[PDB]
Chains A and B, each alone.
Chain A
């Protein structure tokens, strides 16, 4: 296809430019190439150090994608710089591994116990593993629904309470510490219907154990309160976007601020104190936005990625301040950085919780990048 070739040519040509600019825009850039593409990515909490070594070791929960051969749940170790056969190892290796029935849409560990890893299967089953019970048959199977799904979310204030979004217009909620299991299976403590179409994502409120937000193709954002009796009455419903909403994420330093990403090429800034008013809209992306993560370190900056192969980093503070037309190009003032090291759609990304500004993004070309934008791009 002509349009394909043209695209490809632009992709490759810009990527050359990128590489050449690398030393100016970044302080760290690693580009590993997994055996199989990953659809998920999340940094584990822990960090491992050794006296003497000029690096610390961090880890990522990755996944494999092959509708052909065997799939796996992966744990990758990564060597990151410090303040400053039998041969030394590559900076990136795969420590743990676990055969997985079908690609891994998402893989997220449980806050209260990082050994517990929840999984989203291309099936209808939501799997749970303990990467210790496997030094593969999952330690838990979660009934709940019929269609496949990506949305997945552990409750920080309620050990075990996990939520999942699905293509069957519903949201399940199981307690992993579920009384009994009747054959490694937990049915579903609740199922939230109230949603016109496919639910794209789900997210527990960070501080209020009985709250969470859903987002779906029915272009709406719904806030829920498990304490309610009707599993159809969402505490609130917001006409968040024009197109389908693919994701939502709560700000780590707030109890009211939210953020959603839609196919409408937009990221909406929401405040629970008044879901009637959309605080602001981040524009610049040129395609669907499936990911939106806040920096675990700075309350004012968040990131977004999608089909345009670009990862955008925005700084709320700069929302407003006037800018010169010849500068007001490239994008709005809230736009702080654009990462264009990826050559395909970015399937997922994660902020390193321990090393401010280190981020890990995964692409469909099975490429994995661990980068960190130049300090002068955000300092001074």
Chain B
């Protein structure tokens, strides 16, 4: 789930 940090990075 540190992919939330990655998810947050996308935009």
Question: Are A327's CB and B7's CB within 8 A?
Answer: no
Contact between B9 and A21, CB atoms less than 8 A apart:
no
Q: Which residues of chain B (1-11) have a CB below 8 Å from chain A?
A: 1-2, 4-11
Determine whether the beta carbon of A330 is less than 8 Å from that of B4.
no
Report B-chain residues with C-beta under 8 Å of the C-beta of A336: 5, 8
In the assembled complex, the Cα of A337 lies from the Cα of B6 at a distance in Å of 9
Partner of A21, one of B1, B2, B5, B7: B7
B9, chain A: closest CB distance, angstroms: 4
Q: Kindly count the residue-residue contacts between A and B in the assembled complex, taking CB atoms under 8 Å apart.
A: 34
For the complex, give the distance between the alpha carbons of A380 and B9 in Å: 17
Chain-B contact segment, one of A62-70, A237-245, A370-378: A370-378
* B-chain residues with CB within 8 Å of residue A338 when the two chains form the complex: 8-11
Bound form: Cα–Cα A338–B2 in Å: 16
With CB as the reference atom, state the residue of chain B lying closest to A310. Answer: B11
Give the nearest-CB partner of A331 in chain B: B9
Provide the main secondary structure of the chain B interface.
Answer: helix
* Cβ contact of B8, chosen from A327, A337, A380, cutoff 8 A: A337
**What is the minimal beta-carbon distance from A11 to any residue of chain B, in angstroms?**
13
Closest CB-CB distance, A363 to chain B, in whole Å? 15
Provide the residues of chain B in CB contact with A376, threshold 8 Å: 1, 4-5
Chain B residues lying within 8 Å of A380, measured Cβ to Cβ, are: 2
Known contacts A338-B11, A340-B11; is A374 also within 8 Å of B6 by CB?
no
> Which residues on B are within 8 Å of A, measured CB to CB?
1-2, 4-11
A sample of 27 inter-chain contacts (CB < 8 A) reads A21-B7, A24-B4, A25-B4, A25-B7, A25-B8, A310-B11, A327-B6, A330-B6, A330-B9, A330-B10, A330-B11, A331-B9, A335-B9, A336-B5, A336-B8, A337-B8, A337-B9, A338-B9, A338-B10, A338-B11, A339-B11, A374-B4, A374-B8, A376-B4, A376-B5, A377-B5, A380-B2
Closest 5 CB pairs of A and B: A338-B11, A330-B9, A340-B11, A337-B8, A377-B8
Contacts A331-B9, A335-B9, A377-B8 supplied; 4 other A-B pairs, CB < 8 Å: A337-B9, A374-B8, A376-B4, A377-B5
